[PDB]
Ligand binder design. Structure first.
Ligand SMILES: CCCCCCCCCCCCCCCCCC(=O)OC[C@H](COP(=O)([O-])OCC(O)COP(=O)([O-])OC[C@@H](COC(=O)CCCCCCCCCCCCCCCCC)OC(=O)CCCCCCCCCCCCCCCCC)OC(=O)CCCCCCCCCCCCCCCCC
Ligand SMILES: CCCCCCCCCCCCCCCCCC(=O)OC[C@H](COP(=O)([O-])OCC(O)COP(=O)([O-])OC[C@@H](COC(=O)CCCCCCCCCCCCCCCCC)OC(=O)CCCCCCCCCCCCCCCCC)OC(=O)CCCCCCCCCCCCCCCCC
Ligand SMILES: CCCCCCCCCCCCCCCCCC(=O)OC[C@H](COP(=O)(O)OCCN)OC(=O)CCCCCCCCCCCCCCCCC
Ligand SMILES: NC(=O)C1=CN([C@@H]2O[C@H](COP(=O)(O)OP(=O)(O)OC[C@H]3O[C@@H](n4cnc5c(N)ncnc54)[C@H](OP(=O)(O)O)[C@@H]3O)[C@@H](O)[C@H]2O)C=CC1
Ligand code: SF4
Ligand SMILES: [Zn+2]
Lengths: 89, 182, 377, 471, 114
């Protein structure tokens, strides 16, 4: 079926000759469709004015630890935890 | 994962019907066997008699399934002692090496058709003592297992859900319908 | 230097050989539920093989094999022998195919034509299409181009089909291995039980053809046969050759049956065992003919006219065809195994005998090669 | 500051530490190979005052990627058409055995760069059982040099250099050839007030040093005492002369080796041995210490019908120089140019998956330990040769490592005493490779296969391209 | 290099030799009962060899205290076998039947892999 040849977001797939596909003849291979690498890429960056800002995952105690980011460089800056991007202009 | 049908889509689907073989049998002989096969399954499905194994601290939650809150007996499940009259074995607990020959024998003495349920992590894959020097790493090493109920211990409802899975597994046996093709 | 079919490291041999190891063999045992299958599958599971076990009937029969292997190393695949689409699914990833499909009698849906020759060909033909490297088939040892009957007017059909099935297998899969066993035994069998059953007797007796004195047999323990199948599977040198699977010793059928009934404590002195000559009593042949007709699923006590003809024919081990000793198997003698096979069939087993109250039975006397010349004139 | 290639791969508590040694460089620095679930994550320096000093050169630190690329997994054999196909072991060893019987004694072997002492000894014994004696190495060397163990070692121990007072570097850029030694020289330069001089192309050592010039006749000038720096060496309380192993391989090397080895005896002071040869391969010292001849031309000159390339992935040998009737059998870990010529490739294990003895430049024998199982159907290097004798018919005296080690114990007793040194007493235009940082990273098969070292080469080149662009 | 110690069961090698033989007696007497009361393939002659085979394992043992311990453990099994506390599986455990032979020759091990 389709799922056998589908390649997961981690980049793994059994070769069409690999015997290990035998395990899927009577079952399915759920490949998640909501790839995190693309959903985070979709969200646009946040323009700021201050020189340093903080992201906490967005919901305080339900988010990730509060980390501060420095925006001096031109390129928009990624948060280590949540992956959100920040930029000063 | 196959998700459930939407209401509007499901609003058209025909009623499922009881038998999992449908009423689409071509011949009379096949159809009679199909219906007759349901009669067997209805019988075995109704009255599933565990063996009262109760090895370890899953065993306590195997009592509360018989307690008034959940009442295994409502489903025709009746505990029994002798493996001859017992139909199902619920291996609930940590099957150590010293026990292992005893479970094998007790399972063998059970007459066919016999189904095994594995309760909790201990009996599933060795659980919390997986690496111990005197633990059989899962009862499936010793006897075939038909349903795996995860948990530690599984909740009473969790085991109940397991038992109903065994009823459905029993409900769809093709003991007769496959004799015809054989 | 045989080319390595695939260099993907995940599909290479790994480990110490225990259950968690891997042989690099992806087998497919057609007919794993049968008597031989239980022993082939378990021996594969020890090595670390990954096996697909197609099963035609309900899962209940085959579910017991899941214990043989390790996690993810045993997979079941429902299939219908007539439908090739079903079979391709189970042979499209395999390196080895083993064909233990056959029956001792005919059915309403499967005559010997459909199973032994047409069925086995279909499994072999599909295997070649998929690209299976190895193939293994079973056949009788006395297989002949046109076997003559000995006591039953239609008792040779089973062998005729087996011979024809053997050729079509070699036709479809020219480098197929063929192992030709003879009177396999050792538990859940139809040799040591077919002689210990109630039906076979007549109230205490044993109708044997010529009293069994003109029949010579070389029974082989089933485990040795299973070891042969696997050893042939691990080796490519064994491809495209015929192997005869026979025991180490030859016995007259009269000599064997006497020895069983001594092991079973069913001696003539007390129990009342005695040997007819099957030709004298026609009642016995009626029992088989009645027995075959009445029972829908499987004959009771393994008794039916086809099985009778197997008993009458003496094993004919050809000279010059390789034996399991060529495959490295060390054959177990009957004296080693049979005394433990028949412990649960012993008579007066409720006794709780004191030590020595039952004397150890005398062993059977094999038949020397020269004596077989005289015995057969 | 943290390792970029290793980023996020694992955590400390998970790791199972495996003390080993490095082989990409001759210094033999001690190592702790971090392993987790049958894979080398990183390589860390193990403290060892006498050799390592807790530092570690990059080529040792970032070779762990090379062990996961271009690796040989299955035996391979040249088909009649000309391509290689993978085959089973029983088939391969039998295929090679046919060549050996048909070769009829015209056999030769060539040890490589990453070769092992134990594997090298097996290769020697196997060829002696066949009667052949053409057992060489890849690096060339002064003829007759193997007679005295002091002729090819750092007689002044690695630790001993840091006390040095006047050092003469002849055709040696230790900053790249063996950085851990240079780290000791700079330590002397900072603290012990070291005076340094060079003979060869201008280079930078990370510290001030005089360049006497690249002329060949200089070395005889310094020896003759006429040269100005010659006064410095004869006055210092711990003079030392370091000569690159590359120069000795050169044709002139024998004369150069004689003068300085003659000059050192004048400079020789109580408990100090000025003469010092700087090696660049972990295999070389062990090979010469066992009885190998030197130079890959010792094997070409025999015109052998069968040749064993044991980890010999240098480009020194080429399929043209071989007789047109030849059978090249390459026993190694990484498929490279060495394998590209081979007629029958037998996979070996890399140093992280084989317990083997290596002899560092100063003479210390040290033992690796197997942190990782070898991949695919790879086996240890000596196991193959031990097995290959069976299919040829002359079983070797030993069937276990301890049995093999005792054979070394009989050839050279000191080789057993691991982590120790035996003093060897007396010893009886220059141009250099490896003068640029760009040339430092790509010197070995393991390094040459490293994805990380590809980035470093591009990074160094990238900066140079941009720098000239701005100007 | 000698030290003073507390004896286990015996004081002299001769007494230790005497105790060990008794353990051989009791086992050799017991084999006929074990065959009857256990559903196992092995016969008396085969078992009586296994008794001989294993008493030979500890061929080079010299220390009396070690010999005492072997006889303490050796006796314990016999009581657990004179009784049928040991099950059918345990008795056959003395043969290692399930484990198939592992070849010893170098060439076979190399081809088979580690
Ligand atoms: C005492 C035992 C009775 C206990 C009381 C409950 C019984 C009634 C019941 O549950 O009705 C459910 C049922 C409600 O379910 P449903 O949604 O309509 O559809 C039923 C299945 O889904 C659709 O049925 P299905 O065909 O998909 O699966 C059932 C399968 C098999 O039926 C069974 O499951 C029972 C066991 C096997 C059949 C037993 C006979 C064996 C062989 C028959 C062939 C010859 O086929 C049938 O036999 C059903 C056909 C109905 C005629 C029976 C033949 O009630 C009815 O529709 C009919 C009323 C019950 C009949 C009353 C007749 C009174 C006559 C007086 C005498
Ligand atoms: C009457 C024969 C009794 C057979 C018996 O007792 O089996 C146990 C026992 C051992 O049988 P077994 O060696 O396991 O053979 C298994 C058969 O294949 C067992 O037969 P199956 O594997 O084909 O499964 C179906 C089973 C049951 O038969 C059926 O499936 C049809 C019965 C529908 C109700 O067949 C039988 O048990 C034979 C009974 C056939 C009698 C048919 C008479 C029809 C009129 C009565 C209605 O039989 C005896 O040792 C002595 C009984 C001989 C009298
Ligand atoms: C007290 C109340 C009792 C209620 C009894 C309900 C009985 C329903 C009968 C269905 C058969 C049940 C027994 C059985 O399981 O037989 C199955 C057998 C097929 O088994 P088989 O193909 O041989 O499987 C492979 C084994 N190696 O089947 C066969 O081999 C032959 C099947 C032919 C069809 C037989 C139908 C019999 C109907 C009996 C109704 C009885 C009513 C009176 C009770
Ligand atoms: N005494 C002996 O056993 C000897 C061995 N042989 C041959 O070895 C082979 C295996 O031996 P044995 O185990 O005793 O045979 P069994 O009768 O015990 O089992 C045969 C297997 O083949 C399956 N089978 C039979 N017919 C079909 C069919 N139409 N379609 C699919 N599967 C079918 C059966 O499946 P299921 O039961 O689930 O229906 C069963 O699993 C046999 O073919 C036999 O002829 C030859 C000479 C002597
Ligand atoms: S699985 Fe958990 S609850 Fe069940 S016996 Fe084991 S430890 Fe107790
Ligand atoms: Zn964040």
């Amino acid at each position: 079926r389709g799922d056998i040849e589908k390649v997961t977001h981690t980049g793994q797939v059994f070769d069409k000759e690999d015997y290990r596909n035998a395990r899927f003849v009577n079952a399915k291979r759920y490949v998640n469709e909501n790839w995190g690498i693309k959903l985070i890429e979709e969200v646009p960056p946040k323009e700021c004015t201050e020189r340093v800002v903080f992201c906490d995952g967005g919901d305080g105690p339900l988010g990730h630890p509060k980390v501060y980011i420095n925006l001096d460089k031109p390129g928009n800056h990624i948060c280590g935890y949540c992956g959100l991007r920040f930029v000063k202009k | 994962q196959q998700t459930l049908p939407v209401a509007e889509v499901a609003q058209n689907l025909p009623k499922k019907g009881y038998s999992p073989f449908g009423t689409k049998q071509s011949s009379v002989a096949e159809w009679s066997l199909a219906r007759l096969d349901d009669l067997l399954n209805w019988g075995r499905k109704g009255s599933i008699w565990p063996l009262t194994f109760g090895l370890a601290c899953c065993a306590v939650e195997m009592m509360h399934i018989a307690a008034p809150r959940y009442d295994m007996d409502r489903y025709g499940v009746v505990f029994r002692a002798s493996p001859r009259q017992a139909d199902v074995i619920i291996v609930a607990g940590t099957l150590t090496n010293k026990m292992a020959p005893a479970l094998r024998k007790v399972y063998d003495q059970m007459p066919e058709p016999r189904w095994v349920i594995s309760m909790g992590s201990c009996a599933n894959g060795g659980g919390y003592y997986h690496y111990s020097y005197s633990v059989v790493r899962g009862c499936d090493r010793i006897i075939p297992v038909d349903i795996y109920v995860p948990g530690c211990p599984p909740t009473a409802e969790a085991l109940m859900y397991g038992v109903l899975q065994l009823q459905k597994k029993v409900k769809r046996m093709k003991t007769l319908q496959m004799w015809y093709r054989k | 230097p045989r080319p390595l079919k695939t260099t993907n490291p995940a599909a290479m041999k790994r480990g110490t050989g225990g259950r968690s190891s891997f042989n690099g063999i992806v087998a497919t045992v057609f007919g794993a539920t049968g008597f031989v299958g239980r022993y082939v599958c378990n021996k594969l599971g020890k090595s670390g093989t990954q096996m697909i076990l197609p099963y035609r009937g309900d899962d209940s029969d085959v579910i017991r094999l899941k214990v043989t292997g390790d996690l993810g190393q045993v997979l079941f695949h429902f299939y219908n022998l007539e439908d090739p689409a079903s079979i391709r699914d189970a042979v499209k990833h395999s390196n080895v195919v083993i064909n233990l499909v056959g029956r001792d009698f005919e059915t309403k849906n499967f005559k010997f034509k459909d199973v032994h020759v047409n069925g086995a060909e279909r499994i072999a033909r599909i295997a070649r299409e998929a690209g299976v490297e190895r193939f293994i088939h079973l056949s009788s040892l006395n297989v002949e181009a046109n076997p003559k009957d000995l006591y039953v007017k239609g008792g040779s059909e089973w062998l005729k089909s087996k011979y024809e099935g053997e050729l079509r297998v070699r036709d479809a899969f020219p480098n197929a291995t063929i192992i030709r066993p003879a009177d396999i035994y050792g538990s859940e069998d139809r040799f040591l039980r077919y002689y210990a059953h109630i039906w076979r007797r007549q109230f205490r007796s044993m109708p044997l053809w010529h009293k069994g004195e003109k029949t010579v047999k070389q029974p082989v323990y089933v485990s040795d046969v299973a070891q042969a199948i696997i050893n042939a599977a691990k080796d490519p040198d064994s491809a495209g050759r015929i192997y005869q699977a026979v025991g180490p010793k030859r016995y007259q059928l009269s000599e064997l049956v006497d020895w069983f009934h001594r092991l079973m404590r069913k001696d003539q002195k007390r129990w009342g065992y005695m040997r007819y000559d099957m030709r004298w009593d026609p009642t016995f042949l009626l029992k088989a003919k009645l027995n075959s007709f009445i029972c829908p699923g499987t004959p009771i006590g393994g008794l039916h006219p086809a099985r009778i003809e197997r008993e009458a024919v003496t094993d004919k081990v050809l000279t010059g065809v390789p034996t399991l000793e060529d495959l490295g198997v060390t054959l177990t003698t009957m004296e080693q195994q049979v005394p433990w096979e028949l412990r649960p069939y012993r008579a007066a087993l409720y006794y709780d005998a004191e030590l020595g109250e039952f004397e150890t039975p005398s062993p059977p006397k094999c038949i020397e090669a020269r004596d077989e010349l005289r015995l057969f004139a | 500051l943290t390792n970029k290639p290793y980023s996020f791969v694992a955590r400390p508590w998970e790791i199972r530490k495996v003390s080993s040694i490095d082989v990409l460089d001759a210094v033999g620095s001690n190592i702790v190979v971090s392993t987790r679930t049958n894979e080398v994550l990183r390589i860390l320096p193990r403290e060892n005052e006498d050799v390592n000093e807790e530092w570690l050169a990059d080529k040792s630190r970032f070779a762990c990627d090379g062990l996961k690329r271009q690796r040989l997994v299955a035996p391979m054999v040249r088909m009649p058409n000309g391509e290689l196909q993978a085959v089973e072991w029983e088939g391969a060893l039998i295929a090679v055995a046919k060549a050996i019987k048909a070769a009829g004694g015209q056999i030769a072997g060539i040890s490589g760069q990453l070769a092992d002492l134990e594997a090298q000894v097996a290769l020697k014994d196997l060829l002696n059982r066949l009667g052949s004696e053409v057992v060489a190495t890849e690096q060339g060397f002064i003829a007759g040099g193997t007679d005295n163990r002091a002729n090819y070692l750092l007689n002044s121990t690695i630790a001993g250099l840091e006390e040095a007072d006047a050092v003469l570097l002849v055709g040696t850029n230790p900053r790249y050839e063996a950085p851990l030694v240079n780290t000791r020289l700079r330590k002397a330069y900072v603290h012990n007030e070291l005076q340094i001089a060079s003979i060869g192309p201008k280079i930078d050592l990370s510290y001030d040093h005089e360049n006497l010039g690249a002329d060949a006749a200089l070395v005889k000038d310094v020896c003759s005492g006429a040269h100005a720096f010659s006064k410095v060496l004869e006055g210092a309380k711990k003079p030392a002369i370091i000569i690159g192993a590359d120069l000795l391989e050169r044709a002139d090397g024998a004369a150069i080796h004689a003068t300085v080895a003659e000059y050192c005896k004048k400079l020789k002071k109580p408990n100090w041995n000025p003469f010092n040869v700087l090696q660049t391969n972990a295999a070389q010292v062990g090979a010469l210490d066992v009885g190998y001849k030197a130079g890959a031309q010792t094997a070409v000159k025999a015109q052998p019908k069968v040749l064993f390339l044991l980890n010999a992935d240098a480009g020194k040998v080429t399929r043209e120089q071989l007789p047109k009737d030849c059978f090249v059998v390459y026993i190694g870990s990484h498929g490279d140019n060495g394998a590209s010529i081979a007629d029958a490739v037998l996979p070996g294990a890399a140093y992280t998956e084989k317990q083997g003895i290596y002899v560092n430049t100063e003479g210390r024998p040290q033992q690796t330990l197997p942190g990782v199982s070898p991949p695919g159907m790879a086996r240890e290097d000596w196991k193959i040769l031990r097995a290959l004798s069976e299919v040829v018919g002359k079983p070797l005296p030993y069937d276990n490592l301890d049995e093999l080690r005792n054979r070394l114990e009989d050839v050279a007793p000191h080789l057993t005493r691991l982590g120790q040194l035996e003093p060897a007493g007396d010893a009886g235009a220059i141009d250099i490779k490896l003068k640029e940082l760009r040339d430092y990273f790509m010197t070995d098969a393991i390094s040459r296969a490293s994805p990380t070292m590809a980035k470093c080469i591009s990074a160094v080149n990238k900066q140079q391209r941009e720098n000239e662009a701005k100007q | 290099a000698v030290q003073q110690v507390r004896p286990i069961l015996s004081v002299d090698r001769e007494e230790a030799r005497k105790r060990a033989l008794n353990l051989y007696k009791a086992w050799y007497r017991q084999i006929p009962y074990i065959v009857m009361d256990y559903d196992i393939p092995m016969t008396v002659e085969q078992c009586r060899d296994k008794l001989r085979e294993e008493f030979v394992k500890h061929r080079n043992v010299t220390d009396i205290r070690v010999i005492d311990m072997l006889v303490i453990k050796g006796q314990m099994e016999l009581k657990e076998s004179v009784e049928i506390w040991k099950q059918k599986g345990h008795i056959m455990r003395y043969w290692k039947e399930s484990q198939d032979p592992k070849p010893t020759d170098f060439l076979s091990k190399f081809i088979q892999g580690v």
